[PDB]
Amino acid sequence: QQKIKDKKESVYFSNQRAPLGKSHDQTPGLPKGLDVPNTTFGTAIIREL
Amino acid sequence: QRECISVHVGQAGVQIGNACWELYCLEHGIQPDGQMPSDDSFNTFFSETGAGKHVPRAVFVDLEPTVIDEVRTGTYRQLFHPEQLITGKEDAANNYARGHYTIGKELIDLVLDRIRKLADQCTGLQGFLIFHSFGGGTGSGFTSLLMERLSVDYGKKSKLEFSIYPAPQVSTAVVEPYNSILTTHTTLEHSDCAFMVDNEAIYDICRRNLDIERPTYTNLNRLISQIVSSITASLRFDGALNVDLTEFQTNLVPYPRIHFPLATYAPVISAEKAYHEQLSVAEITNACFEPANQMVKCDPRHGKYMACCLLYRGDVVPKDVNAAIAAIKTKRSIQFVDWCPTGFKVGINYQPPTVVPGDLAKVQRAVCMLSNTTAIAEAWARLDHKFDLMYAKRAFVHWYVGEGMEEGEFSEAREDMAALEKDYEEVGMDSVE
Amino acid sequence: QRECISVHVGQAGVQIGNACWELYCLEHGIQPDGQMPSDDDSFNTFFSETGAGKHVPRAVFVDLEPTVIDEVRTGTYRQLFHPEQLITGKEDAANNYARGHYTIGKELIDLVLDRIRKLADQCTGLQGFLIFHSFGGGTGSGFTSLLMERLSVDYGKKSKLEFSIYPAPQVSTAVVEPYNSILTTHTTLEHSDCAFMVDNEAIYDICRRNLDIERPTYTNLNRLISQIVSSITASLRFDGALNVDLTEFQTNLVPYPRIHFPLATYAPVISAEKAYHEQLSVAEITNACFEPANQMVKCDPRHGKYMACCLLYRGDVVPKDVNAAIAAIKTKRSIQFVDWCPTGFKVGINYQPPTVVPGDLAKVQRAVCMLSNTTAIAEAWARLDHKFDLMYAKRAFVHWYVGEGMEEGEFSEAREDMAALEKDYEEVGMDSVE
Amino acid sequence: ERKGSLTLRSHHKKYSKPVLVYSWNHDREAY
Amino acid sequence: MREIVHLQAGQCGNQIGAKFWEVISDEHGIDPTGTYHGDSDLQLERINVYYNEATGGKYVPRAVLVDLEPGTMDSVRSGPFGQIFRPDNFVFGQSGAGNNWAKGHYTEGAELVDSVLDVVRKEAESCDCLQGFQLTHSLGGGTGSGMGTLLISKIREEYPDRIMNTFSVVPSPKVSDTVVEPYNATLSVHQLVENTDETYCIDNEALYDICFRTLKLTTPTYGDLNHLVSATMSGVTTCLRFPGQLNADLRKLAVNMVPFPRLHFFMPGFAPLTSRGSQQYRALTVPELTQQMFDAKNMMAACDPRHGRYLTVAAVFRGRMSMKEVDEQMLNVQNKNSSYFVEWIPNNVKTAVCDIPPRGLKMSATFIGNSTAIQELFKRISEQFTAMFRRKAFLHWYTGEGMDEMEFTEAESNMNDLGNPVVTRGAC
Numbered sequence A: 001q002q003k004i005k006d007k008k009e010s011v012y013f014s015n016q017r018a019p020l021g022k023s024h025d026q027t028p029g030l031p032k033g034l035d036v037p038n039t040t041f042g043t044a045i046i047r048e049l
Numbered sequence B: 001q002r003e004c005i006s007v008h009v010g011q012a013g014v015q016i017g018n019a020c021w022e023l024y025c026l027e028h029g030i031q032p033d034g035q036m037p038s039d040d041s042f043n044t045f046f047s048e049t050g051a052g053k054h055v056p057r058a059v060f061v062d063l064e065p066t067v068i069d070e071v072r073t074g075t076y077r078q079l080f081h082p083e084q085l086i087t088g089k090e091d092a093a094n095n096y097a098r099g100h101y102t103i104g105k106e107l108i109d110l111v112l113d114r115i116r117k118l119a120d121q122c123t124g125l126q127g128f129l130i131f132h133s134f135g136g137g138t139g140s141g142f143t144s145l146l147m148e149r150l151s152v153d154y155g156k157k158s159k160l161e162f163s164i165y166p167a168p169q170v171s172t173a174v175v176e177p178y179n180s181i182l183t184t185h186t187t188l189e190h191s192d193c194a195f196m197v198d199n200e201a202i203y204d205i206c207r208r209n210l211d212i213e214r215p216t217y218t219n220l221n222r223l224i225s226q227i228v229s230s231i232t233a234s235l236r237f238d239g240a241l242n243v244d245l246t247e248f249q250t251n252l253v254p255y256p257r258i259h260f261p262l263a264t265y266a267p268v269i270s271a272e273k274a275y276h277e278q279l280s281v282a283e284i285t286n287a288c289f290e291p292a293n294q295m296v297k298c299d300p301r302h303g304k305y306m307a308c309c310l311l312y313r314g315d316v317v318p319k320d321v322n323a324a325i326a327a328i329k330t331k332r333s334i335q336f337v338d339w340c341p342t343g344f345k346v347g348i349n350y351q352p353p354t355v356v357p358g359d360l361a362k363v364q365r366a367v368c369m370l371s372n373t374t375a376i377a378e379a380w381a382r383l384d385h386k387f388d389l390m391y392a393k394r395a396f397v398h399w400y401v402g403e404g405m406e407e408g409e410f411s412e413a414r415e416d417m418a419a420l421e422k423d424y425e426e427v428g429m430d431s432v433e
Numbered sequence C: 001q002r003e004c005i006s007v008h009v010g011q012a013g014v015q016i017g018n019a020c021w022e023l024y025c026l027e028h029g030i031q032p033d034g035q036m037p038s039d040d041d042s043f044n045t046f047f048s049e050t051g052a053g054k055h056v057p058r059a060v061f062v063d064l065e066p067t068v069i070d071e072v073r074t075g076t077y078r079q080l081f082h083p084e085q086l087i088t089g090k091e092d093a094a095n096n097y098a099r100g101h102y103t104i105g106k107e108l109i110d111l112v113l114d115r116i117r118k119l120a121d122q123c124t125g126l127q128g129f130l131i132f133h134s135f136g137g138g139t140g141s142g143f144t145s146l147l148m149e150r151l152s153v154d155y156g157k158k159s160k161l162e163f164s165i166y167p168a169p170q171v172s173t174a175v176v177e178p179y180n181s182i183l184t185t186h187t188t189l190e191h192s193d194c195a196f197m198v199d200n201e202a203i204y205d206i207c208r209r210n211l212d213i214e215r216p217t218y219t220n221l222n223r224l225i226s227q228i229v230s231s232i233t234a235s236l237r238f239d240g241a242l243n244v245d246l247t248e249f250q251t252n253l254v255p256y257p258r259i260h261f262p263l264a265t266y267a268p269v270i271s272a273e274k275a276y277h278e279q280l281s282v283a284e285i286t287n288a289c290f291e292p293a294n295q296m297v298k299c300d301p302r303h304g305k306y307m308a309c310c311l312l313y314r315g316d317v318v319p320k321d322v323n324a325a326i327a328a329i330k331t332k333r334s335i336q337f338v339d340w341c342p343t344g345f346k347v348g349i350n351y352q353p354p355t356v357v358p359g360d361l362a363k364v365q366r367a368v369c370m371l372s373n374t375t376a377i378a379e380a381w382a383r384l385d386h387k388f389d390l391m392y393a394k395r396a397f398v399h400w401y402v403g404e405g406m407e408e409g410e411f412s413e414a415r416e417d418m419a420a421l422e423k424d425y426e427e428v429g430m431d432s433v434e
Numbered sequence D: 001e002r003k004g005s006l007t008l009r010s011h012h013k014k015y016s017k018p019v020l021v022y023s024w025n026h027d028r029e030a031y
Numbered sequence E: 001m002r003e004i005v006h007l008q009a010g011q012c013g014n015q016i017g018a019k020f021w022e023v024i025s026d027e028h029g030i031d032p033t034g035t036y037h038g039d040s041d042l043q044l045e046r047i048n049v050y051y052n053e054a055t056g057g058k059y060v061p062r063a064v065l066v067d068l069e070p071g072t073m074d075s076v077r078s079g080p081f082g083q084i085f086r087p088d089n090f091v092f093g094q095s096g097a098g099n100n101w102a103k104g105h106y107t108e109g110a111e112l113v114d115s116v117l118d119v120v121r122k123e124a125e126s127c128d129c130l131q132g133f134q135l136t137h138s139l140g141g142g143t144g145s146g147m148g149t150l151l152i153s154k155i156r157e158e159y160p161d162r163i164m165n166t167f168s169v170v171p172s173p174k175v176s177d178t179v180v181e182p183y184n185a186t187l188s189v190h191q192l193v194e195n196t197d198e199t200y201c202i203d204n205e206a207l208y209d210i211c212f213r214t215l216k217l218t219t220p221t222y223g224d225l226n227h228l229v230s231a232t233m234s235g236v237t238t239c240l241r242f243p244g245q246l247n248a249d250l251r252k253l254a255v256n257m258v259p260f261p262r263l264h265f266f267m268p269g270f271a272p273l274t275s276r277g278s279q280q281y282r283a284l285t286v287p288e289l290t291q292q293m294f295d296a297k298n299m300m301a302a303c304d305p306r307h308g309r310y311l312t313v314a315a316v317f318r319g320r321m322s323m324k325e326v327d328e329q330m331l332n333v334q335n336k337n338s339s340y341f342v343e344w345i346p347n348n349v350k351t352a353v354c355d356i357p358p359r360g361l362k363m364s365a366t367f368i369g370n371s372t373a374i375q376e377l378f379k380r381i382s383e384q385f386t387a388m389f390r391r392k393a394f395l396h397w398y399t400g401e402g403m404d405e406m407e408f409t410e411a412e413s414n415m416n417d418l419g420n421p422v423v424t425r426g427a428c
Ligand SMILES: Nc1nc2c(ncn2[C@@H]2O[C@H](COP(=O)(O)OP(=O)(O)OP(=O)(O)O)[C@@H](O)[C@H]2O)c(=O)[nH]1
Pocket: B009, B010, B011, B012, B013, B015, B016, B062, B064, B091, B092, B093, B094, B095, B132, B133, B134, B135, B136, B137, B138, B139, B140, B164, B166, B167, B171, B172, B173, B199, B217, B218, B220, B221
């Protein structure tokens, strides 16, 4: 817990834009409820007829 | 039926295999234990025994412990057959002499016996994918010995290499020019196709396109694992242009010696960078030929592409690729050699790329671009210069010559690479006759 | 089909485009987020169709300094712009044209052109480029010139218009506007096919004497500029009786290959509790265009001859009260023309009424932005010329440029090209006697 | 290396009733 | 009756033939289960041209499916009309062709060709009056190019009096789907030119020009492309399959479109082709059928008819139709663009009318052209071969499988000995 509170006090820094094994704590740059593991990306193919 | 055998040598080879197999289990549906939670797509890389407990076709051999012990102690302990995991008791210690001559013989019979045993339950064998670097002593000398003995025993089979190219600016060792020069001199006559992968370029693409300022080798190996799964996708699922390893061999290399392609991957894009793109086939084709998604740090416009093999994976219409290659072949930044009017080998698979819990994104499309080009000549020549300056006054030669290697192997390797540079220049020169 | 790419450079260009894209997102049905709320093709010009309808724009926002684009990426419209169409620098151009063209800037021009390449690749018919620069700083002058050069080299023959903020006749903000403006005009006079100007003090006056606000600020100015830009590009977006295109502007407004400098004049600038009392008919709003106080540049047009005007009516404008009003303006003897150009007043009419941002402008059913090429702007060019002469009489502020790496002699050909522009303006202003 | 049905052969095919064979006249005679 | 033995070589040939046994199966009313569920009694009268029968009314195709890799085979079995073929006829082999004509013709291709000939001997001895063999294959790549031309050689050697039809796809100028397509196409055509009687060169770029310009589609798939192939590849054998006035079998198609034995390369074309956006505005009649035939957009070979003179035109029409229209319209064509038809062959245009249109249409037609325009394709492939053969490139696997230097030069000389007669006809 001393390490958990240490990193909670330390998440005010450049640590949030350079996480040790992550990217950005990506969530504020997506829609609110989105389910990032789901929702395949890009434009799908419509395939009319 | 259409299977391939994976070999993993060295620290790099073992952790690349770790990433590749944790990708393959998620790709198929196999849990880390081995039981699939519940039809024939598995058969290429995963063998099947009683009580449905699917096992990889991989030989993990490394001459020093604790790295295989991570594998056989961690979560994927119950997936691998422990007699595949081959451990020595002495680290090769960045010496090709210790990789090829002294501690290669106590373990080469065991690893070849296991390779033969996996060849036994293989009806039509397509070939080998051997995973290493050009760095440490294990992944240099032991893979040189493996390519020699495998060319001896399975000479008609296709043998392909996944080699971590030594980083041209940082390095992780000071004898990397020696080790790389020796392993490529002794695998040039036996390797059929050697996919180069760098570390500098994967750091750069992880900072630019993956948006991680703090990446580790887990992320690095996950990107390389996506490359391996992308080229070995037609052997696994069905597709439009079902491509083969022998077809890779006949397309990616014109001459008997010019067999060092470069691998690139498109959608390397990282969640809050792809909701704003259509991810259409044209722009994901352009991303391969842009000079920043190259995964080997050599500049393409200072050279000419010999042959490009494009591997489209997922929902790809078979003819936006036609429009994209048509758009590419009119441009001037991408230059082809004059003796190769044809330039492309297109393969299309209908399986979308899976996402590992981690860095990359759930994209409906992907493409792996394997290019044989002349631009790798500068990459070879700079380490040839590095060899010449380090060898001009006999640095680090005493370990190599005193462990059992003769002196003349260094000179033979240097002359072989002078010949290789001369070949690159002769091929890159245009026609006047 | 009918799309064009917007490049927004400098702090002025970035803020102008902030209020701009603020206007266009409410022009169409696009949220601050980007999806259309709840449940035809007008979005295509300025927005794309990335899957499940996210609608990312076609802007490539550049700044050689931080914090200005960082407010955009951490405020309101932070979800709508792509993170890599907003490129930032780690230093400042610092009012130094040499530090917009050389030193800082050449490390970033590669990434800027690469993003421009990607957006151009995802376009079928790329109608043109729209550069929003400022003529006053370093970021909007030197990087603008470098951009103009490389854009002209790689994407040739395509229309490329600048919507710039011309330096004030007396007011200004900085001290090196003469140097910066003359230098970038010299560099970008032979590549930019056309360039409209607006002036800060003129917007101040038009917002103090029509908008009834006695204390406007940059947001208040930028909303009117956004309305001008939207009236220019609304015909490329919606349907009307006489559709006008970017290439059609590029041919109609510019007589000579060097004289490519029109001035904007937006009309109905009425102020909410003044708008219910006029008829707001077509004749009087045309009179408001050609009246020399609604001009968006502080340059008196009575000191000169009009060369070509493009009127862009939007709203429920009947096609031929335009005819009556243009004939009425033609008959007046103080709005004078060059004798060699009888056809002067160009009609574009759009069935799109103006859309009001919460702010100063009112609900108007008719609006125009009159675009005047005239030889009156030779006086403003001459006063900036005289400022440069007083500047360079004793080599003030030259040490920064020279110690950067700009050659000492470049001021001389900048001065010579400005003298050439003065001579071309005075030669095209004269009456034909042969 | 023969595989089942490729050892067994014939020199004449048998056809169903609504098939125009050579002996269409010959069997349609005797129907 | 006259049976037509069908042969599939290569992945391209297998998928094209799979769409063939889609299209003619639901033309002839054969369901996926193998029974007969039709509507008319006329559609079983010539069922003994593509389907052998088994016990209980199981109509099995007389198609021998050949591939060097057993994955396209499993794809065909898992396809819609997969459980229709003979299970013994799925002649596979656990090996790798690897897009090498040497590895398809002088190697395990020549090891599997014996079993392939055994099952073709099966299907040709169980007959009475055999007319021809059709092979679907790809000139580029292997398997279809490798064992395909080998199959042509052995089949024509051991039955020398039957028609050979080769529905072959050719490389396009815009792209290439394999970097050894020039080599494979040269070695394939060198064996095709003193063997076969009718070839059909079908180009993918021409297919996309058809699909994008005329059909107005945005996402054409391989089912789309091979269905366009299968339309003509069904339409050519329709006077032999269904009654009509001026019935013309494949053999007199051969004698009418072959003036000289080398010049037998054809450009196909199917032309009741309507976009869905213009189907309701279409006015389907024989004059517009010919006007959509002869424009330079609907031939499936990517080579331009405006750059040469036609030697022979053939039109197999399907549908109940008045042929005073047909006669006057083809005469209006022959006297309209007269310089694009050869003067030394008066009435170089053939007409064959079947009463029964394909299902879903009233009015259809397939167009077969023997013209000078194949010269452009031949010279392009010859230029690619000279460019990549001058510096010995992509060639050591060709040598290492048991080849010689002289075979490539003989193939190139045979390409030029094809180019010479097709340019002598351009200047008479
Ligand atoms: N993907 C991946 N690559 C690695 C990893 N570790 C090392 N490498 C690469 O391998 C090079 C040096 O390690 P190796 O060549 O694999 O060393 P080795 O083959 O195990 O031989 P020894 O050093 O004697 O143990 C480095 O330059 C890296 O580029 C890893 O953990 N993951």
